[PDB]
Amino acid sequence: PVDVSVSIFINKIYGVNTLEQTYKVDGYIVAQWTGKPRKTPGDKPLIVENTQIERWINNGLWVPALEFINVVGSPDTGNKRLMLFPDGRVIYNARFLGSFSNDMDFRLFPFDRQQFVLELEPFSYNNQQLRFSDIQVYTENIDNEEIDEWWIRGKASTHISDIRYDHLSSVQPNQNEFSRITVRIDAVRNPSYYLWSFILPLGLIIAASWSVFWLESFSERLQTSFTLMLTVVAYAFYTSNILPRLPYTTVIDQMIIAGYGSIFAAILLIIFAHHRQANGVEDDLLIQRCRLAFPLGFLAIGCVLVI
Amino acid sequence: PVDVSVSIFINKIYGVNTLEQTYKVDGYIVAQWTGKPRKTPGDKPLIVENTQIERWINNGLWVPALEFINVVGSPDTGNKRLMLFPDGRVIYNARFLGSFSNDMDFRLFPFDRQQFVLELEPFSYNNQQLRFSDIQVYTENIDNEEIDEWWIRGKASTHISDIRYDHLSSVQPNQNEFSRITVRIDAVRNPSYYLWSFILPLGLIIAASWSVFWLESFSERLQTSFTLMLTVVAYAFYTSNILPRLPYTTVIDQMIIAGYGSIFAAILLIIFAHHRQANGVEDDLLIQRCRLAFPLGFLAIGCVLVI
Amino acid sequence: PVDVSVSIFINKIYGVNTLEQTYKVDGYIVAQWTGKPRKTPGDKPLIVENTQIERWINNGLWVPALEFINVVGSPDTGNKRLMLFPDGRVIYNARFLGSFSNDMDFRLFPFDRQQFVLELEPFSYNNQQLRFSDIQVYTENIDNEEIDEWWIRGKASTHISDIRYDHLSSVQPNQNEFSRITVRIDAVRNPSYYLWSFILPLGLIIAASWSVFWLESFSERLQTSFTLMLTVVAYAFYTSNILPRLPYTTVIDQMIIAGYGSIFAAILLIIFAHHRQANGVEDDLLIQRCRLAFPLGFLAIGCVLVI
Amino acid sequence: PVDVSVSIFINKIYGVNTLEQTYKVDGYIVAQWTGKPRKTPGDKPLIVENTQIERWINNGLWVPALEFINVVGSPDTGNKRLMLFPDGRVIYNARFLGSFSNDMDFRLFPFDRQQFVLELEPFSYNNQQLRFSDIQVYTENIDNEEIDEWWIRGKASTHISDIRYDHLSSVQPNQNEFSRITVRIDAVRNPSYYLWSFILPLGLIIAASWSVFWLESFSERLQTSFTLMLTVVAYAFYTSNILPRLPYTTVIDQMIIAGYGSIFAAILLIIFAHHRQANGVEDDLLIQRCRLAFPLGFLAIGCVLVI
Amino acid sequence: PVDVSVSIFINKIYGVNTLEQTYKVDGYIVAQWTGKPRKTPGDKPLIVENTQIERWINNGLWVPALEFINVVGSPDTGNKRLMLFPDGRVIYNARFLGSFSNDMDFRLFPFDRQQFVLELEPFSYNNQQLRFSDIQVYTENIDNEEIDEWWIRGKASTHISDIRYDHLSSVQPNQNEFSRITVRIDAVRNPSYYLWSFILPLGLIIAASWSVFWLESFSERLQTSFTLMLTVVAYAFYTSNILPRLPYTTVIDQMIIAGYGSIFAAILLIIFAHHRQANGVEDDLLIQRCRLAFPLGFLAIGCVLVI
Numbered sequence A, B, C, D, E: 001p002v003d004v005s006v007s008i009f010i011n012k013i014y015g016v017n018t019l020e021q022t023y024k025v026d027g028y029i030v031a032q033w034t035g036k037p038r039k040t041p042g043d044k045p046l047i048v049e050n051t052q053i054e055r056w057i058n059n060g061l062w063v064p065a066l067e068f069i070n071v072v073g074s075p076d077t078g079n080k081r082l083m084l085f086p087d088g089r090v091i092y093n094a095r096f097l098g099s100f101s102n103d104m105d106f107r108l109f110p111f112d113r114q115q116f117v118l119e120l121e122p123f124s125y126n127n128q129q130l131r132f133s134d135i136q137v138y139t140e141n142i143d144n145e146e147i148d149e150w151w152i153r154g155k156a157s158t159h160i161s162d163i164r165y166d167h168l169s170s171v172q173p174n175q176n177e178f179s180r181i182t183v184r185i186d187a188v189r190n191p192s193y194y195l196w197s198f199i200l201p202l203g204l205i206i207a208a209s210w211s212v213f214w215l216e217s218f219s220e221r222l223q224t225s226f227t228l229m230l231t232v233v234a235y236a237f238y239t240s241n242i243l244p245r246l247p248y249t250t251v252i253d254q255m256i257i258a259g260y261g262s263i264f265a266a267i268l269l270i271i272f273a274h275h276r277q278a279n280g281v282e283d284d285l286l287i288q289r290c291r292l293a294f295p296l297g298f299l300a301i302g303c304v305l306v307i
Ligand SMILES: CN(C)CCCN1c2ccccc2Sc2ccc(Cl)cc21
Pocket: A010, A011, A012, A013, A014, A116, A137, A138, A139, A140, A141, A143, A144, A145, A148, A149, A150, A151, A152, A185, A187
């Protein structure tokens, strides 16, 4: 029941695809497993590069297809070598680049925590078993990830479990448990750019929205409101175009509704102030001095968005 | 004849293409059919991975080409294996990723019901027949599909029918009926994001449009109208850019015309109010008090849009 | 001088590319031609699927390369089979998906008439001749093409002509005429979506533009004009972003200039009204009552855009 | 020292990539060169299609690799044939589609002159020499290029030169001259669409900008200015989004700055008019009658942009 | 311990991908290494083109797989030849196009200094050693790079170092040092287009923002502010859409915050001017004459953004 040692060097993780829940991984994979000893030229181990490998299989060299359970489409394989040893053991080494899939919650958008994952498992073997898994990452955190998009927290999570697959296990009675290496890296989104360039501007916009109450007239107040309305729609548009498209509301996306909200609530007061009066036309004395009472009400409702 | 058993494990459905009427499906396919018994090493069934399979065909191993009738372009095949059994039976197992086509009506956009479908059929065989079809999906609904885009309703629809193909059936008299497995999964779009972030803001915009009638002057009313106009045009643009492009009007797209409508009707009234008078310049008393009569008229017309 | 029968099943026409003048076609092609009789296993015709076909050629099986003259780049071939008959005749069957090119005039944009075309011709043979061509489409019109983008008018146009190629016809004296099947289907664009959601809103915008003359002041008129100006620029952008990019002006594109025009003509009038006076400041009495004279002038010039 | 005749049929030039300085070319290439006579079946020349060609090379048929020096990435080769003649001569014929590179100055954008270029050269041969080059283009100009994007001026420019490659010419002393066919077609951009739909609207915008001086007040002038400001930014965005992205300023891009300019110069005057006075508040009499002095000043500076 | 000479011809560097930190490089690679002498036809060196090379490997011709350590995904290889010499030495020559990765700091965006790099290293060999590296670039700077995007500063940096790889060096005790050629060219972004068409317009916008203080009223000042607000949001959008997307703030991106700032600071002043009074309503005399005190304060804070 073959023992297989696996090592995965991760070179670069890039291009998140928020809608598809998808990321790209470039790196090498290495499998080691000891076979029947053989004679090599010299006694030095034998090297078999790329195209040559497939020919060695046509002569009965077994090389297991190791599948990336969670890759979306067969990955781009760059170079591959076999290292055949005189004492039997064999090393398969190949570089890959593949688009991998995992579940990703983006609802806390500018302040994400995500988990990038690889799942390796032999494509047709249940008593060939993944001996031990080792993943080599060569980075540093908190660090250069002001230049880089993501903040890794954890380093090394491994598994190597056994997967059941209870469907048509009578195709082969008593044996359908496959050996699955699971590799998972934890990361945090860098919430600088989105605060410094999206969160902040929007707040100023919502803030300046409230300054509508310090207009003297009523016509001034109500008309200016419509320009504030336009300003949010504009800023909603600006937000939407640049930010990652999703099927749920982000934090930013909520704040944008909060904008749409405060402004439309203003409209109501501004008008109800005019027509809650003792005569025909008296702006209600205290009410249009919600000047420093809208900011508080918004900020009060903006601390229950948090919990 | 030949009886062929088929099993389809569905791993992921993603990336709908509204314009092309197209979706992406990643999963495995398994075919099983019993052939002439053979001698395998040991008596254990024989495994043939990838490249090696094509070599076994050059020696007369028949392996039927199974086509995805409704795939748009040949799909990306990841790994494939044969399981040759000593008692004859043979198992073909391969992972696929393909862009599939089906008829898709998107006119009720934020509230979709769709039917994602696979059609499998042998490419050159009419008395080789699909024994039984089984589809293995491992998800759950209503559930995580707040994080996920779609709500699956039904589970398992299968068919396995016979297709006629009456065109040049004299090429082979009396026999042109092909065995077609049909798999179809029903799903609903998650109308959360689009209401909370598109439907709602637009309504607030259309609502605030009506507040034009609570402006005192006429110059105020008519001028402000044009800013509302801009506001919709802006919001139409924002809508268009982010939402899926189509060749028909969505529900949202209608509401956007309702905006364009209410605003241009306002302009007419606002102007007709001014010059339907007893003197030269008397704004018609009751009419500019369609303040709470446009909302009713719009909401009345917005309850016949439903039926 | 070989006779070749051809049949083309068209499965889907999708993804027009206005700029490249390009469309995608998925379907099957079938070629039939009678050769020297042979012994088949049994007397049943022999089936040769995909990879195996190329092996049969290495043994002297001639299979002519049929080129798609008007495909842009080698197409995606899905599955291919040979049907070798004991009485000699041979059937080549393969599914294709390819991006095809044809001349396409889009100047009458939302009201297009287009002609989608396939051109087949052997790549190196002049006395091998296309016997007869048959095209199988299974759709219906006027019908589902409210859900579908295009209205097919004609059904079936075929040709099968002879092409000259007078360039280096001394490379082979007296024989350079190639047999070319030409298939062309006529279709009309579905002018619903673009009217109900683009043409109409623009008209309402342009109409409301004229309501500038019903502003009492002159400052009101001239200032409001600039908001109308902005309104068009906004709507031009909205138009441009969503509509298919082209190297000529569409019908919609003309209407957008008419906006830019009337508004700038308004500016001129609005200002010329002010300073064509008997005193220093008398708005010219009749002129700013081009209220229901601009609409007429615009509509008159919009009936010579048609002829 | 082999003489090679080449002919290049050009089918379509499309999809310019302004940023990458890149265009797509679909067409056929044919190479002819006389070799040692051979026996063909019959005495008719022998045809070798596609896959069969590579097999004929495995038996010592020499077919020179002809490289497209200026293709960006190996091109899509569709079909290839050999025509082996009994008297020796051999014809290589293949269809290609490739993305080609050349230097492209787009600074005079809507009024471009460009030169689309092919460079062919053997990949490993210096005394195999390109006998003569012939290029077959089948179009017409000035003509259909209102429907088409470009105006070809010249027809056929050819070269066929000798390239030195003085770097490691001691790898092979005295002989490093490669034979390079160079083909270049001159073309002009069709400056209709960009004038009728971009240049013109912007001028109207800039023109109407000057009508700010015909506003009576000062508050009217300065406030309206900011709306003009907004109008240009709007039009700049619309411009930028639709027009080809570049690393330099186009003509349009300059005109867009001219808008930004006149409007900000207006602001200065409008304000300087107010406070260059004899009392506290007297708008300077002659200056705000730069009404027909800004258009002149702009038009004067717009005649030195030309030379 | 094989000595290998390498030469790298760089044909084109294009298509920077700011987000992925990635650029495209088209060029040729040449490897030379002296092997066991052999008999060639004639005594002229032997040429082996493309497909033929792989056949020569099946007969024991060793040709080392040279990997591009920093290429993202296996690169597009166009043409490859071997030049086998009678005296043993062998030349591998092939054209490549690949997307290469390197660390790229874009925080000083319109004024970048970047370093485009190739890292070559054998895929499975430690005592086969890269003798010397030579890179051939044929361009010129400062020059055509007004038409071109980038300014190369340095010419030629080479290395050829030894890499440790201390992980599973017991897989082969005492020998895990690989020979790595490193090539790096230094380049600067062309800060013309981004100043003349983005930086400049924005300054005029921020400048004209300050002219809000020269409005006579308070209602005039506060209302106009909101139009300025809209103006920036518009210009941020225009910027964001066209400029390269990043996960940090560019210089331009900061200037956009400065706009958002000055305008929101204006609003406070404008309002605090109104309500810092001796009576109920006296605009504070000196304060709304921060007319030429906001420009100084902004420029003062705009000289500490630099250091
Ligand atoms: C500051 N450093 C964390 C930069 C690393 C960025 N990069 C990355 C990108 C997107 C999501 C997750 C990651 S983690 C990671 C792990 C290994 C390597 Cl080699 C690269 C990465």
